[PDB]
Amino acid sequence: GKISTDKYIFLTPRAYIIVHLLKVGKAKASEISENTQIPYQTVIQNIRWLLAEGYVVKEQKGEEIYYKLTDKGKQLATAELEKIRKLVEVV
Amino acid sequence: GKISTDKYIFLTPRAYIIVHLLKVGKAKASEISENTQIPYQTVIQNIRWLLAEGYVVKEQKGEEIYYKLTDKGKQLATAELEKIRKLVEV
Amino acid sequence: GKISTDKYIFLTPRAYIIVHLLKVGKAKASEISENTQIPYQTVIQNIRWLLAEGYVVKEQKGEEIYYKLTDKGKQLATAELEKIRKLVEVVQ
Amino acid sequence: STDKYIFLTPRAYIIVHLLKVGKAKASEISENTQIPYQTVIQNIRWLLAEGYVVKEQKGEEIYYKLTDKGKQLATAELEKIRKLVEVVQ
DNA sequence: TGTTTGCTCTATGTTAATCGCAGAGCATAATA
DNA sequence: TATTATGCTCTATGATTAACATAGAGCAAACA
């Protein structure tokens, strides 16, 4: 189909998640949602893509689960992030 | 919508496309493609939407069709170009 | 979550998907939906989880996208199928 | 991450147990299948509403059993199963 | 009489899962 | 040579509900 959004013209809802896993290092499904305001349903489906690809792993701390970046994760979250600013500088 | 995929971890084709328009001034259809590495079809319907919203404008400099950013698009470009550095600050 | 539903009283949507991948090898999300009569939206929702948990892997050559079971994938399957063969067994 | 209910549902065991036994207390089915009690009732609450099982209060001893409509569904769903298993080979 | 021990089911909030609609990424066939 | 239509894919996420855990609470026979 076509396009219609004011929320994600430039940044994906994923970027807000990976970034918040840098600022906080490790977070919880619910928690990510709140201090990012990205809908919970969206967060879980994304952290799930991150789990599969290895950018994140979970720490089941009791009745709760915690999602945190990895070597590969912190890597992408950093290097690929540079590409962001390396082209944001030019403007 | 199909916002974030594999090809697009951080930025949408809208990003690479608008930016490239700030860079080149007025690129054509395929031009934005070859540069941004984004598949043509994706590009063309994002431009179809940029026209719709008034961020881009059709231009007839020759037989072919070139695309430039309106000031409205530029205001969007710059404006959200800060939510990129801002959020990234951490 | 919601595991037991009017449509899933005994088997879950996973039970059907995994077994389709078993029988078929590689399959498109659609295909799996079309063969299990499980709504598509339910299908990727669980594929996406099977990817996270490393039971399933994505194979895509540009347009065509497939999904196969990993090795823990075929492991989970035969182990689950066991808890089942055992179930109905004790039921007789 | 419902690694607890991957192929089968809590409903699957609850019913299958009430076939093996016919009569059981809520606390019984729960203990005897490793299913949290609060899940067992909420399920029995549905099983009663859809009329698949029925209550029986002989004093302060409450028991649950399948209706005819229950065993019907029981041995029926167990067929969608029986079907699915063997087709894997 | 009343409190305790103990069993039972009820009230219900948090998270997680079914699965629906409106996207949107992109490839190809169709059309200007 | 480029745009739109067509259509198959996955995504964004919201509505409904289940899984199950915390805190009741109806109410038995057993202490004090």
Throw out a few tags for this protein.
homotetramer; 91 residues; alpha+beta; Arc Repressor Mutant, subunit A; three-stranded antiparallel sheet; 4 helices; 3 strands; DNA-binding; plasmid (chain C)
General description of the model:
- Chain A: Keywords: Plasmid.
- The structure is a homotetramer.
- Chain A is of the alpha+beta class.
- Chain A has one domain: Orthogonal Bundle (Arc Repressor Mutant, subunit A).
- Chain A is 54% helix and 14% strand.
- Chain A is built from four helices and three strands, in the order αβααββα.
- In chain A, a hairpin with a 4-residue loop joins β2 and β3.
- The longest helix of chain A is centred in the C-terminal third of the chain and has 18 residues, at 71-88.
- The N and C termini of chain A lie far apart (31 Å).
- At the A-B interface, α1 and α4 of A face α1, α3 and α4 of B.
- Chain B binds a DNA duplex (32 and 32 nucleotides) through α3.
